[PDB]
């Protein structure tokens, strides 16, 4: 009982001694010894040619393992059992062995039953072997849609969920192979776009194997980017990026009509493809159409130029209305010029918002239904243009895509508040027809509500300017990274919201008995916004505000005392407040800082590619001919088969050259990328052993 | 919840600092304790509108140093009625030294340690959460506590 | 090395059984008296052999259960033997990986169902109010096999 | 002008075509071709055997490069020029070539003129080659002390500073070689201790090459640690750690007298050596002498045991005096028991400090010269013991080492304050004899000063407890790391100190005109510690305090206003205060956080070794029998070379076995650690080429 | 039965995962060099007209 006796618990059938030496000859590369043993086994039947080593590797698997082709034919000529040898040869990636097995054409296996030669070849991503199999009329099962309820999908999931999930992943691994896509895909770039997008969606539905599907999607994105990297001239790049996969759309004269494939890449979120330097360089040429040497100019001439066009925005817009074909009427159509004019037309609007409160007319604070002032009249046309422009996106873009962009949510709220202000101002103008001191106005007076709504819109309008940071090389990358950190912060606010409610309920439950009236308070002021704070925890609504303000240290400690001076109650209430301060300010606040620091490190990895993708969307929104006029001026009122066939022929020629260059580069990159392994050392050793045995056959003397 | 074990260790060092300064401040100020009848509004302590007797007793001193972490203790609590200038300056220097140690040094040290500890925890979050969720799921597989508390009696 | 271990095991070999961590027998106390350094190294060498995945796969009747218990015992050892805590924690992690890797080789739902619902000859009485199935999964939870539980299948 | 013509600017002498083929034969391994060309060179005198490519590599260097020993002998037999071939062979680390060159007997070199065969061999750290050279009576120059002003050191740095610095570093690289130390050092462990310590000091004096010397010092520390790792029994470990290098100097009693080598390692700061698990395990056995199964006990029984021992500390201390040899009088001598008794005797002192203010007697607030109270009398014996114990170390440890420990600075200040309190209390007792209301006491009344000094000591006494965290496995590692972060923070406070002074000068320069009197302030209170803060920036001393308190938000904004209401002056003063807040709270505070986070990451990877070193010092301070009694009770009143020779013989035998095991492990660790290089691939290719030529040579008539 | 199949698959995978480790050591270079040296000596031993 002081020793553990070790024995074989699951014993297999032992291998004879004659077979053991026969296998050793194959490993050593001893062709002569193997030839005699095979020939002897044809008569004596003393050794088993198919001797199953407990590891499962027969002589054939050992011959394939060492890449010894000459011996492989020796065993194959002797009618040895093949079984799953083709898969083992394909995995080893020995072209000679694969051709040999193809030419002629429950046991333990290292492969699952669903793996086929074509699927496994695509998994290895070997261009040469995949070409050999594809030439023999192979096919791959088509996976069903992500959300499929057919009888086969449901029955397979219920019959064997584990095998069903593994089979589907194996198919997608083969389809996502860059070598297979380059060989069998009519449009490899489009195929990589759709395949990578489909895999990203699958990684969400199939959350158990999310990492596997996300790696396949990344592999598809890289392949499309690497194909674009092989472009060698601007003509090749122009052909690729302007290719229309389909026709009969009839397009839209208001649309840009060019860069069709670039737009598809943006739709599928191909950020690396869009951020490619040659693609970016071409885009900058269109963006800076009127400035051939923009990059060579000093930062002072650039800034001076921007102010000149910005101040000239009022008449550039007018020219586009009067004489669009004129020399001056064409400047506004240049994307960068149009962007500056829109920005200038918006900075003017924000300047007038400041002037709203800068002008104060004494004796006019008491008009209940005052009419619009001078500043308000000028602001009105801007607001109508902003509302008209946003509705113009409803009918053009569509309901679904609008809500995706967070900046559109701020645009909707801003326009709704402006509309409410106008309607409220109209009601007050009609309801009241005189002056009255503002001190006697009711809490919900329409004029007071309109002023509050107008002021809230002003904050939203000013914050809109932050979206323009994307155009700047210094601020854009930082602004984009900041917006990526807001989603992680939002998760944290869920835990803090629970803590705030838990303590708010407890504090209000303790203090609601001692609520006092405003008449009994000094200055007749009740609440925490008074000079002497009181009734901090009298009601639940007040308690929530008090705990919010204590986060910034604006709630005084004396609010925990009651008039009756119940010492035990006051101490308990102050301990609840103290415990809340510890949890929120010492623990939760620091946890958010630690979480933010970790998340920012990851975000900083992809800051450049993310910003470039965002700036590309900004630039493309000014290429179109639709919204040329800024908001102030935007409210004033046969057969093409032959042309499409040629466009497709040029695309195919470029795709053919890109694949040729890409395949060579990948075959080149492997021979210098990775170091040697044990399989290489074993292969080299076997080569010498085979040579030694073959040479020793011719013994001059002994 | 995995970060709370590391935070608890750091709370041992802060408690020693809090007790060390609480003893020193109370040892200096307990001579000047005043009665509630002699205070405005008849209110004694730091929860009054005009804070007083912050360091009169050890129990009160511990609360005063706790509240100063959040900036809710006013500076004038370091003054005594007799206006002993040397005593008041020494007491205000103890309070100032405590603020430096707790808010400038110890608070930032906790932040630095939390950032380092969170980085390690973040690489095992998926496996840790899935283990926790498995325990949650398995507690509902049994047919023992099917009825919620309202109906389980 | 699986091949070499098989050759030796076929020749009727044995390994000393380590005593429980908290053992006060004459041998454990006396051995730790004459040579503590050698006693500690001898015990660690035995556990390195027992934690070998190849040996467990070859000589263990129930390799999954053996890896669960062996890895749990090594984690407790890393606490008592704090001088060599890192060595024992690496062995425990090695046992946890082996059990998870064995589960990774399941190729059908039937195989996974058989493994996770296996009872190690409990006999005994089972409470009808309790959950009958997933006996081995519950054992993995008891031994804190987080990687095993978090396996995607 | 549009093309850049490329030409050889620094042209060397060209090599003839006959020599080019002759060198190619050596690289190919063609022994037959090389031999014939050598035969021709003896008669024709057409090719130059000593030919060197502009790279400097002659045939001999090429033969050494490929490790082709047979050819190298072929060239050596032909009287080829040797020059610096031995260094190249040593650098290549080919034992065969080195022996051949040793047995044998304005040019460009890859080695500096100061490099010798023994120095270069030690740089490579090759045990076999170093043994070959050491057997031939080699020597290495002895470097002078770091601070040397001899004629040679000063003159050498004058003639060539660059060469002087490089020569010294080359010597230290050879001396720090683990192979050389193991071969030629009588006591390799002591040699590594001293050599590594000397290199660390050199890395400070040599500012430019600090990194090089720090790596050598780390290499010496690792070697000593690795030698200790080879111990296989407790007897071997005991022999090593208890070895005394010298015995002539008498060893005073009352000391531990054992672990002499361990104490030497602590003196030289060998943290890795001390933290070795086997060394730590042996130390824990001595530390827990009375608890054979301490580690096996539950955390509850451990805590219960500690309380029982601590409460009994008064009784154990008494026994050590009444009956030191008795059964009870021996418990206090166990290091862990003694540590608990000292801690308990200190917790009692801190408890009585609390009782100083918990007890108040009415009418005693006015005694000017009050005598000691009940609590003060009990505290007195503790203080005398603390002062006596600290002086006992100054006359025992020494002035220099005492001040190095930061905790000793707090012990000195604490004892000085306690002494000042006693003397001040005595003066008040003698100078005054009655009771007077405390309100009329002067600012500098002796009783008031004594109370303030006593309270300051109480804070220091309590803070001393933090040093006991080192004994705990959970708190010790964190406490040690926190103390390592304080040195980085101290540098930051230098920049903040200048910022505070810069703004304090500016604010005081602006506000000192408007200073008001206390009589003119409400409640007659002047300063920022009043209920209504005033005179914040009237004086420089006050201004510094005001800016300090604003860091915590305790300075109100209204302190920037003056009575005269000078609007421009007030705005300027508030802008100075605002600018200071931005610099200190928004910029400098966050910079410290960022610096602390980076520095803590580095400290965190060495926390375990640093804590274990600190805990070892704590444990060793209780092994000695000097200060057994806690402070409360510590003031009460023929030829002997055979032992040293035998003790040295056992140490040498153990050292011999440790070196043998270490050398094998290092030779073992190299063959399985690093991958191949171009030198290995080139050598393997040459082997086949040499074999191919030699086999082909065995032919018929050509 | 299931345990037997799982061990068989696991053993093959671990034996497979080592051959693709993507690394080499000096002991491999020493062994490869020795193979050529042994072959060279054996071939040379069969000399002809001496
Ligand atoms: C939540 N909380 C609180 O609400 N108050 C105000 C009470 C009403 O005024 C307190 O004073 C108060 C308090 N937590 C306190 O110590 C905590 C501080 C933190 C950092 C959270 N660590 O980590 C622990 C270890 C949990 C101790 N203290 C101070 C205190 C201490 C002892 C005594 Cl006898 C009296 C006061
Ligand atoms: C602990 N402490 C304090 O308690 N008080 C209040 C006293 C009672 O009001 C202070 O004013 C006070 C203070 N540490 C002070 O400087 C320190 C502040 C810290 C953050 C630790 N760094 O960075 C250095 C550079 C070391 C300066 N100052 C300001 C001060 C300075 C000089 C003079 Cl002559 C007078 C005041
Ligand atoms: C140092 N400083 C200050 O002392 N005061 C108090 C004056 C006396 O009350 C201020 O108000 C004041 C101020 N820096 C201000 O803006 C800065 C603040 C910091 C954080 C440095 N960033 O981020 C920028 C973007 C540079 C703006 N502002 C506010 C302000 C701004 C414009 C105008 Cl016209 C008036 C006030
Ligand atoms: C509330 C209002 C009245 C004050 C704020 C308005 C302006 C002071 C600033 C705020 C943000 C600025 C914008 C931020 C970013 C850009 C992108 C920038 O892009 C480029 O053309 C430069 C790109 C590069 O050089 O990399 C052009 C200026 C512009 C529109 C800036 C114009 C001036 C703006 C509107
Ligand atoms: C009564 C007032 C004055 C407070 C007294 C202080 C105590 C509340 C605490 C503060 C720090 C504590 C010490 C912190 C660290 C240690 C080391 C610790 O070391 C061990 O023996 C355990 C080691 C391990 O288990 O790893 C023993 C307890 C002790 C002395 C603690 C004893 C209790 C102390 C003194
Ligand atoms: Ca919009
Ligand atoms: Ca001391």
UniProtKB/Swiss-Prot annotation, chains A, D:
Subcellular compartments: Cell membrane
Tissue expression: Expressed in brain with higher levels in fetal brain. Found in cerebellum and occipital pole.
Cystine pairs: 525-530
Membrane disposition: Multi-pass membrane protein
Residues exposed to the Extracellular side: 357-376, 427-448, 508-575
Domain of life of the native organism: Eukaryota
Binding site for Ca(2+): 390, 393, 408, 411
Reaction equations catalysed: Ca(2+)(in) = Ca(2+)(out)
Positions in the Cytoplasmic compartment: 1-297, 333-335, 392-405, 470-484
GO cellular component terms given for this protein: calcium channel complex; cation channel complex; dendrite; growth cone; neuronal cell body; plasma membrane; presynapse
Activity regulation, short description: Activated by G-protein coupled receptors via direct interaction with GTP-bound GNAI3, which increases the channel sensitivity to phosphatidylinositol bisphosphate. May be activated by intracellular calcium store depletion. Calcium channel activity is enhanced by MYLK, that promotes its subcellular localization at the plasma membrane.
TM spans (from-to): 336-356, 377-391, 406-426, 449-469, 485-507, 576-596
Gene Ontology molecular function: actin binding; actinin binding; ATPase binding; calcium channel activity; clathrin binding; inositol 1,4,5 trisphosphate binding; store-operated calcium channel activity
Residue spans of the ANK repeats: 16-46, 55-83, 84-105, 113-142
Intramembrane segments: 298-332
Positions with a binding annotation for Zn(2+): 144, 148, 150, 153
Glycosylation site residues: 433
Assembly and interaction partners: Homotetramer. Heterotetramer with TRPC1 and/or TRPC4. Each subunit in the homomeric ion channel (via ANK repeats) interacts with one copy of GTP-bound GNAI3; the interaction is direct and activates the ion channel. Interacts with TRPC4AP. Interacts with NHERF1. Interacts with MX1 and RNF24. Interacts (via C-terminus) with CABP1. Interacts with SESTD1 (via the spectrin 1 repeat). Interacts with PLSCR1. Interacts with PKD2L2.
Family named by the database record: Belongs to the transient receptor (TC 1.A.4) family. STrpC subfamily. TRPC5 sub-subfamily.
Entry function: Forms a receptor-activated non-selective calcium permeant cation channel. Mediates calcium-dependent phosphatidylserine externalization and apoptosis in neurons via its association with PLSCR1. Acts on distinct neuronal populations in the hypothalamus to regulate innate behaviors including feeding, anxiety (flight/fight/fear), socialization, and maternal care.
Disease implicated: Loss-of-function variants in TRPC5 may be involved in a mental disorder characterized by maladaptive behavior, anxiety, autism, postpartum depression, extreme food-seeking and hoarding behavior, hyperphagia and obesity.
Protein name per UniProt: Short transient receptor potential channel 5
Species name: Homo sapiens (Human)
Shown part of the complete sequence: 15 to 764 of 973
